[PDB]
């Protein structure tokens, strides 16, 4: 069962690296005039640690089917913070080459949507 290996591993470091890459475009601008006002919130993120993210993904290397399941799990975890439907595009593009970022091989078939 591929699901058994997913529970043992933790994909949180992979999510941080992908979202921090977006970084919300360090420069200013793109302010919506009618955007929500927002307010102070009750609570710096962890370091890059892309090596740690690959180590978690190293388990799902031989099984390409298991690799895609791990990639889709990353999409589900961060499917709420992504807004605008073009930032989600940016998340999907980086997730596809995330196995390519490591020494692993990207799955041939995978549907992130």
């Amino acid at each position: 069962r591929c699901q058994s290996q997913l529970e043992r591993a933790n994909l949180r470091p992979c999510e941080q690296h992908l979202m921090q890459k977006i970084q919300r475009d360090e420069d200013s601008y793109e302010r919506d005039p009618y955007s929500p006002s927002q307010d102070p919130y009750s609570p710096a993120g962890s370091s890059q640690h892309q090596e740690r993210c690959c180590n978690e993904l190293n388990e799902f290397e031989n099984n390409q089917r298991c690799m895609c399941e791990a990639l889709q799990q990353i999409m589900e975890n961060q499917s709420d913070r992504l807004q605008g439907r073009q930032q989600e595009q940016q998340f999907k593009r980086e997730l596809r080459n995330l196995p390519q970022q490591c020494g692993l091989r990207a799955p041939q078939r995978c549907d992130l949507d």
């Epitope: 970084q23 475009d25 360090e26 420069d27 090596e51 593009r93 980086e94 970022q101 020494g103």
Partner: antibody, heavy 122, light 108 residues
Framework: QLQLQESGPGLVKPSETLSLTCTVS??????????WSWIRQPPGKGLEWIGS???????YSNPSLKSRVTMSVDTPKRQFSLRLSSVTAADTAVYYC??????????????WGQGTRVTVSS | EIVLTQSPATLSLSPGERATLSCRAS??????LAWYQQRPGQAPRLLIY???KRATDTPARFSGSGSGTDFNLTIASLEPEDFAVYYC?????????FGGGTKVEIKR
């Protein structure tokens, strides 16, 4: 074949901001995991990292040069620009442009530019 | 932040003799290291990536070792083209820095 060609003025006024622009032949600006960096080599001195910029806007620069280094990226033009304000005679160096890989196994500048001799003097 | 120190300032050796170049970083960088060869033709190039793997279009005589703090670059036979200046680069932390630089010259 991927190659990087850099263009810019060879003479820079003392206080005027230096502007440099590199053109990417393979147009991998929009490719993920590719940062675009500038490396300067003072005459008779070792290489020095200026800064690296990504296609999404976020960039990283040298801590000693961050206050004076700003970078821009033009994805349709396949160009990433470097601007260095408040130049000093110590900034005389040969400025390179190199591709910056963000992989775990590749963490180097794989392809470098020819090198443009930029000297600052009145 | 991270400081890369290349202890060998300069070494003089005859062709075909083994040479060892050391790059040391007191803040540990780990497996993340790079090696470059700067020639008078003002064209630095990548030789060793990941501190142990040879780059493309690089002769097999080049070799490197990594341990996190001290790294060694070894060449079996010193061909005449190998006499140049070498720099080491790290990427474990975002403040990327290059080494001081080691120059290898011809014994005479």
């Amino acid at each position: 074949q991927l190659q990087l060609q850099e263009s810019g003025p060879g003479l820079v006024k003392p206080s005027e901001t230096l502007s440099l622009t590199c053109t990417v032949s393979d147009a991998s600006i929009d490719t993920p995991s590719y940062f675009w960096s500038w490396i300067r080599q003072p005459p008779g001195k070792g290489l020095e990292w200026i800064g690296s910029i990504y296609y999404t806007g976020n960039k990283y620069s040298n801590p000693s040069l961050k206050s004076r280094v700003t970078m821009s990226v033009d994805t349709p033009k396949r160009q990433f620009s470097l601007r260095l304000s408040s130049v000093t005679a110590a900034d005389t160096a040969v400025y390179y442009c190199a591709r910056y890989v963000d992989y775990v196994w590749l963490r180097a500048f794989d392809i470098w530019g020819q090198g443009t001799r930029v000297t600052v003097s009145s | 932040e991270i400081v890369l120190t290349q202890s060998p300032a300069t070494l003089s050796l005859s062709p075909g003799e083994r040479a060892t170049l050391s790059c040391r970083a007191s803040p540990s960088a780990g497996r993340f290291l790079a090696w470059y060869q700067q020639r008078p033709g003002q064209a630095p190039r990548l030789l060793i990536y990941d501190a142990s793997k040879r780059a493309t279009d690089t002769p097999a005589r080049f070799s490197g070792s990594g341990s996190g703090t001290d790294f060694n670059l070894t060449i079996a036979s010193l061909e005449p083209e190998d006499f140049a200046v070498y720099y080491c680069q790290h990427r474990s932390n975002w403040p990327l820095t290059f080494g001081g630089g080691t120059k290898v010259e011809i014994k005479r």
